[model samples]
Target: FTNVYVKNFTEDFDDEKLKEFFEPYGKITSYKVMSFGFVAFETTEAAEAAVQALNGKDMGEGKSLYVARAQK
Candidate 1:
């Protein structure tokens, strides 16, 4: 479960921002911003780091991020 689900930030969120937000956590294997966002890492350790560091973290403007594991 190295695929991290990230959402609940402003709708203005984009792929570059998503990549930027998660970059410090670990090596990103792939990333995209849909209605929300998906950031995939090469290791579960990276995923866990992302979740632990970012869940409920404020990105900007309004709503904070909701980060977790995703299979969808």
Candidate 2:
């Protein structure tokens, strides 16, 4: 499994919301968004795809997104 980290986010952020965010990327086996908005993705391909599509892109409310493969 791989992980993707989000630098900043609202307190309302959670794993379920992250799952929804990555659903279009592929079949995300799992998602974990910590209290700090840090997120982990379950696949490298999915993480890479997210980087290609959302890196440096805005996620609304002046927040941008970041993506990467998780450290095993």
Candidate 3:
């Protein structure tokens, strides 16, 4: 794994939107979805890049996206 961290996530965020955001950097193989959020990536590099790009991006309204590495 490239990195490992946790964020309070939820389903309010669109999966496709996440995919599209990551697509620009690398392939997104799968998403570990939860009732709140999901862990997504194709490769370690992609995952790491995603963490860097989306760790604090706003998600419309008052919701801010928390991107990070998933815990082992």
Candidate 4:
């Protein structure tokens, strides 16, 4: 599974918004809901690219996003 961990999302962030942000990378198979959750991409390559590009990205109001491979 090409799953990435996403954290520090805004409290108001929704599944749609998350999808919108990630859609450019690749097709998302699924994702969890919460401030910290997992998002699965169609391929590991896309997931790696997302982590490289999106990790520590700003999420407005001084909040920052963290993206990385999901650990077992």
Candidate 5:
């Protein structure tokens, strides 16, 4: 699975909400959970792009999003 690791999301963020955030980028197969969620994409390119475009993005209240490749 081409999964992207995401963290530091707003408290209101959930599996579906997190999936929505990345849905525009590519097809997300699933979401794990908050503080340790994994977003699976259909393409490796999409996952890479998400990391580049979303990493360090501000979520709110001084929290920034973290995006990276999820290690097996």
Candidate 6:
């Protein structure tokens, strides 16, 4: 999946921060809605890497980030 669902982030995280967070893994498009976020990568491989690297990671102000393939 090229798209992921992210949650548990604090409101301090915006679209730009979300993009910055995922940019290291690959080319991605990120946005935040409410307290959750979504990231769309250029390829599934990149998405996979992001999910693996980021899930359960603690960014400190928010809860540990939760990342997974967006439910169909």
Relative to the true structure, how large is the alpha-carbon lDDT of every model? 0.85, 0.63, 0.59, 0.83, 0.84, 0.79
Candidate 2 local lDDT, 1-72, one digit each (tens): 556665555456677777676678766664567553444456667777776776666666887676554466
Residues 1-72, candidate 6: write the lDDT tens digits: 378778888767877788888888887654555557787787789988988999999978657989899655
Between prediction 1 and prediction 6, the one with superior TM-score is 1
Off by over 4 Å in 4: none
Judged by whole-model lDDT over C-alpha atoms, candidate 4 comes out at 0.83
**Which tens-of-lDDT digit does each residue in 1-72 have in candidate 4?**
588888888988888878877878988999866748778998889898889888888999998898889666
Tell me each candidate's TM-score: 0.85, 0.63, 0.63, 0.86, 0.86, 0.80
- Model 1 stretches astray by more than 4 angstroms: 60-62
lDDT of 1 by residue, 1-72 (tens): 379988788876878888888999889978898777888898889998889999988777767889989655
- Minimal lDDT window, size 10, model 6: 28-37
Query: Residue 17's C-alpha lDDT in candidate 6?
Result: 80
Clashing pairs in 1: none
All predictions: root-mean-square deviation over Cα? 2.1, 2.9, 3.2, 1.5, 1.6, 2.2
Positional deviation of residue 24's Cα in model 4 after best superposition, in angstroms: 0.6
What value does the lDDT take at residue 53 in candidate 5? 89
For each predicted model, how many residue pairs clash, with residues at least 3 apart or on different chains?
Answer: 0, 1, 6, 0, 0, 0
The CA lDDT at 13 in model 3 is 46
Clashes of 1: 0
Better of 3 and 6 by lDDT: 6
Put the candidates in TM-score order, highest first: 4, 5, 1, 6, 3, 2
Best-matching candidate per lDDT: 1
TM-score of 1: 0.85
Q: How much lDDT does candidate 1 score?
A: 0.85
